[PDB]
């Protein structure tokens, strides 16, 4: 169940806001995107740009993925993102996340035809 493309969208797309609204943004979003169901996903980034703009990164700067895969791409421009990271007070099933707002390049791995993001590698 769940294509890689749809999983990327579920984990990493939030085009409904221009930026994280409150310090509770990550706690709410990690839960509601089902990333705290069987485990506290330790780290996860949301992108506040249109899906088209994020898909377009698959046609931007070809770079190495962190594991050495050759199908990663860095956005030419910076993007509004929110980094969500599990904090010291976090213990499944009571997950607790630090919310970190930022504007930076995203790096994604792309696959398929249509060639779309299937993994969030990093931000810089």
UniProtKB/Swiss-Prot annotation:
Keywords: Disulfide bond, Endonuclease, Glycation, Glycoprotein, Hydrolase, Lyase, Nuclease, Secreted, Signal. GO terms for molecular function: lyase activity; nucleic acid binding; ribonuclease A activity; RNA nuclease activity. It is found in: Secreted. Substrate binds at residues 7, 10, 41-45, 66, 85. It comes from Bos taurus (Bovine). The chain holds residues 27 to 150 of 150 of the full protein. Glycans are attached at residues 1, 7, 34, 37, 41. Pancreas. GO terms for cellular component: extracellular region. Disulfide bonds join 26-84, 40-95, 58-110, 65-72. The active site is at 12 (proton acceptor), 119 (proton donor). It catalyses: an [RNA] containing cytidine + H2O = an [RNA]-3'-cytidine-3'-phosphate + a 5'-hydroxy-ribonucleotide-3'-[RNA]; an [RNA] containing uridine + H2O = an [RNA]-3'-uridine-3'-phosphate + a 5'-hydroxy-ribonucleotide-3'-[RNA]. It comes from the Eukaryota. It is an enzyme of class 4 (lyase). Endonuclease that catalyzes the cleavage of RNA on the 3' side of pyrimidine nucleotides. Acts on single-stranded and double-stranded RNA. One of its GO terms (biological process) is defense response to Gram-positive bacterium. Belongs to the pancreatic ribonuclease family. This is Ribonuclease pancreatic. Its EC number is 4.6.1.18. The lineage of its organism: Eukaryota, Metazoa, Chordata, Craniata, Vertebrata. Interacts with and forms tight 1:1 complexes with RNH1. Dimerization of two such complexes may occur. Interaction with RNH1 inhibits this protein. Monomer.
């Amino acid at each position: 169940k769940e294509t890689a493309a749809a999983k990327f969208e579920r984990q990493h797309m939030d085009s409904s806001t221009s930026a994280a609204s409150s310090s509770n943004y990550c706690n709410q979003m990690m839960k509601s995107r089902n990333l705290t169901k069987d485990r506290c996903k330790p780290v996860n980034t949301f992108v506040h740009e249109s899906l088209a703009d994020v898909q377009a990164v698959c046609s931007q700067k070809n770079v190495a993925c962190k594991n050495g895969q050759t199908n990663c791409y860095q956005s030419y421009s910076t993007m509004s993102i929110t980094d969500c990271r599990e904090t010291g007070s976090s213990k499944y099933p009571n997950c607790a996340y630090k919310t970190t707002q930022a504007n930076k390049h995203i790096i994604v791995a792309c696959e398929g035809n249509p060639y779309v993001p299937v993994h969030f590698d990093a931000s810089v």
